[PDB]
Chain A
Amino acid sequence: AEPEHDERKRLGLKTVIILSSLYLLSIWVKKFKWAGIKTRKFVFNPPKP
């Protein structure tokens, strides 16, 4: 019923390792690209009439 069984799981192992890494890596890259926005600071000085 599942002749591809052994080979399927071998490919899954490579696929899951690459994707996991890509996932962890993207998180890091995203945080870096967003650091300026995340730590951005505002100050309000009410304008005189």
Chain B
Amino acid sequence: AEVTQLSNGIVVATEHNPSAHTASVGVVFGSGAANENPYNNGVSNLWKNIFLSKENSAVAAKEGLALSSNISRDFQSYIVSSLPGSTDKSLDFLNQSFIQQKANLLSSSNFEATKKSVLKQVQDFEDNDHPNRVLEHLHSTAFQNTPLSLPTRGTLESLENLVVADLESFANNHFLNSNAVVVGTGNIKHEDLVNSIESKNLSLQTGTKPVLKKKAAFLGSEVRLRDDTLPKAWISLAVEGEPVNSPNYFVAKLAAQIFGSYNAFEPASRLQGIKLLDNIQEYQLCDNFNHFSLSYKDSGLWGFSTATRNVTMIDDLIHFTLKQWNRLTISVTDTEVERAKSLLKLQLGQLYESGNPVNDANLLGAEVLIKGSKLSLGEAFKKIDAITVKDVKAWAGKRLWDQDIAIAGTGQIEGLLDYMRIRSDMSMMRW
């Protein structure tokens, strides 16, 4: 439970844990899909793919190292996992790929083979992963003509028109030192890693800063991807949520826990202490749903996603769900809040403390890049337990009550009513 972070020439962040069996090392840059353009959209995802290319991956496999990368909206990460003893050989492969081979990975035979793979990759996503496809379009319409609208995997049209030069241009503008953080998770000590880093000098493009842009903004709107050939309807609906480092960061996440997630086929899920379940189970309004409180640097999204085969009652699904959310402003109970606290801790714990260091790296990296530090799991619980019904009400009355929404859906959505009908349900009539 130690969050150590020091700065020499580069900012080093680590979180050591005795028993772990393995150690993960990697660099996390403060720029992701939110930094791209509509035309070079997908460059970051492309970088990730060559970094994991058969060539670069085989070089690490001989050495007994495993590679992992993750492209997000606000950040980007390249991670190498190793045994606690080879904590130095991971750094050799890291530097060898970001300075030495930052020209060998970009060969005309490797690039074309990779491009052909991310194309079949992004295509497969759009053709079959409907729930994530819908969630991606939700960001697209909610944050249209703004940084958060760009999809992480990039679009097919911007991808196929991408060249080696675009990779370089992005790398020379974002893979900078002032826009990076070296992260180490597993079991290795902070002093053990910082020494191996401060050993090898050479700045390489120091003092250089990444380009600036315009602030992200939420726009109440919708995108309907109707497709009657699909056997279900997948929808996602949300309001402007909370950005990371917001006073209500936790109040929002708790609010989403109150309604939680559901799976009609799992006996135990049908028994949860969620009032909404009394309404949706009678006629089986859906196969599943899940609420979320997505947070990013400039903004976020609070809402839910759902999947259903009850195509003639989608209006009841949306109506009952929105009536429940109305409650947060006027009648949420003490016990609902308390149930949420307990469940929020359990989920927040299971995330922050998993038996996998690669997840730890992403969580640590993403946090330190935005606030310059990481809030300890024990510190979070103190904030969570401090939330009162009055807090949730004040939050809901500002973020949910009579506020614009963003909608996205695909499949048999003929039954999903017009925007104004959904929007009207964001409140209730009163004397």
Contacts and interface: CB of A to CB of B under 8 A. Distances in A.
B419 interface: yes
Contacts of B418: 36-37
A10 interface: no
Contacts of A30: none
A37 B417 CA distance: 12
Interface in A7-38: 33, 36-37
A36 to B, nearest CB: 5
Interface string B411-431: 000000011100000000000
A33 B418 CA distance: 11
Interface residues of B, number: 3
Contacts of A37: 418
Nearest to A32: B420
Nearest to B127: A48
A37 B418 CA distance: 9
A33 B421 CA distance: 10
Nearest to B229: A47
A15 to B, nearest CB: 29
Interface string B102-129: 0000000000000000000000000000
A45 to B, nearest CB: 10
Contacts of A33: 420
Interface in B364-418: 418
A33 B420 CA distance: 7
Interface string B147-173: 000000000000000000000000000
Contacts of B419: 36
A25 to B, nearest CB: 19
Interface of A: 33, 36-37
5 contacts: A33-B420, A36-B418, A36-B419, A36-B420, A37-B418
